[PDB]
Ligand binder design. Structure first.
Ligand SMILES: *[C@@H]1O[C@H](CO)[C@@H](O)[C@H](O)[C@H]1O[C@@H]1O[C@@H](C)[C@H](O)[C@@H](O)[C@H]1O
Ligand SMILES: *[C@@H]1O[C@H](CO)[C@@H](O)[C@H](O)[C@H]1O[C@@H]1O[C@@H](C)[C@H](O)[C@@H](O)[C@H]1O
Ligand SMILES: *[C@H]1C[C@](C)(N)[C@@H](O)[C@H](C)O1
Ligand SMILES: *[C@H]1C[C@](C)(N)[C@@H](O)[C@H](C)O1
Lengths: 7, 7
C-alpha cells in the first residue's frame, strides 16, 4: 500500500 | 469528514 483510502 | 486521505 502506501497511499491511504478508504475506497 | 469521514473519508480518509492522505493528502
Ligand atoms: C491504515 O488503515 C488500515 C485499515 O485500512 C489499518 O489496518 C492500518 O493499521 C492503518 O495504518 C496505520 O495508520 C496509518 C495512519 C499509519 O501510516 C500506519 O503506519 C499505520 O500505523
Ligand atoms: C485512519 O483511519 C484508519 C482506519 O480507521 C486507522 O487505522 C488509522 O489509525 C487512522 O489514522 C489516524 O487518524 C488520521 C486521521 C491521522 O491522520 C493519522 O495520523 C492517524 O492518527
Ligand atoms: C473508509 C471510510 C469510508 C470512505 N467512509 C468508508 O466508506 C470506507 C469503507 O472506509
Ligand atoms: C499519508 C500517506 C502518504 C500519501 N504516503 C503521505 O504522503 C501523506 C503525508 O500521508
Amino acid at each position: 500500500x502506501x497511499n491511504x483510502x478508504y475506497x
